Amino acid sequence: ALFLTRNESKPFYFIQKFNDFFDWSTSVFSSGVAYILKRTIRFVLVFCIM
Amino acid sequence: QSLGDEYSIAWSGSAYQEVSSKGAGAYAFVLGMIFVFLILAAQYERWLM
Amino acid sequence: MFSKFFIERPIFASVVAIIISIAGIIGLANLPVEQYPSLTPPTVQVSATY
Amino acid sequence: FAMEERLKKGKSIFEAAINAAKLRFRPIIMTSLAFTFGVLPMIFATGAGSASRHSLGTGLIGGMIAASTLAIFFVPLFFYLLENFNEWLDK
């Protein structure tokens, strides 16, 4: 609560680019988890195989 | 088989520990598994999750 | 409100019950059983043969 | 987090699982990266204890990569299946 504040934008180009990359990865992971949720039996069988 | 009623077997060190082992480790592991199950069920307010 | 909080959460009371029961089972397994409260004064025996 | 979103936010089981996974994705990646790269020198450690550091670090790194990648997907699946079972029991 003390140290953290509301960032006044001005993100560095590297930390911004890495932020967009992580956002893309998060979207990809959300798509994948939706995929595995829709296919709910194949993946539990895969877990048994594992 | 080789020695009968004239030689008596004995165990020392690791062999003695294995021979005299009470199997308390598996029992403790089962207790810990049950306790973890119970604590998680308490946190989630549901037995299944 | 101590008691009220557990009634809202029956699973919490039940899990406390099972935890107490397993702790008691462990205690009964570990504890020795004995005839009467030991009041025999501790004794040391000295034996010599002439 | 999935249970909180399902019970209080009124989200569907699918939506609650998706949102919980998305919300929890960042901290898991953060801790996985931090400690995996912290213990990476263990696998390359030489000198005293080298065999021990190698043996510990290899398993730690492998299991951590597994936990960060495979389990992160799968835990929402188990939550969704168990929630469907719970809905069945209520009916």
Q: Report CB contact under 8 Å: B38, C11.
A: no
Interchain CB contact of D20 with A (< 8 Å): no
Q: Which two tokens stand for residue B17?
A: 């520990």
> Left (φ > 0), alpha (ψ -120 to 50) or beta: where does C32 sit?
beta
Q: Which two tokens stand for residue D24?
A: 């929890």
CA distance D2 to chain B (A): 11
Nearest residue to B31 (alpha-carbon basis) of D16, C29, A43, D43: C29
Question: Chain B residues with CB inside 8 Å of C22's CB?
Answer: 31, 34-35
Q: Report CB contact under 8 Å: C22, B34.
A: yes
Nearest residue to C23 (alpha-carbon basis) of B41, B38, B44: B38
DSSP code, position D69: I
Structure obtained using = cryo-EM
**Resolution, angstroms, 1 dp:** 3.4
Interchain CB contact of A44 with D (< 8 Å): yes
Q: Report CB contact under 8 Å: C12, B42.
A: yes
D28-55 burial, b at 16+ Cβ within 10 Å, e below that, comes to ebeebeeebeebeebeebeeeeeeebee
Whether the Cβ atoms of residue D42 and residue D57 lie closer than 8 Å to each other: yes
- Of D14, D25, D72, which is closest to A37 when you measure between CB atoms? D14
- Closest-CA residue of C relative to B43 is C12
What own/partner pairs with CB < 8 Å and gap ≥ 24 does C24-33 have? C26/B31
Whether the Cβ atoms of residue B45 and residue C11 lie closer than 8 Å to each other: yes
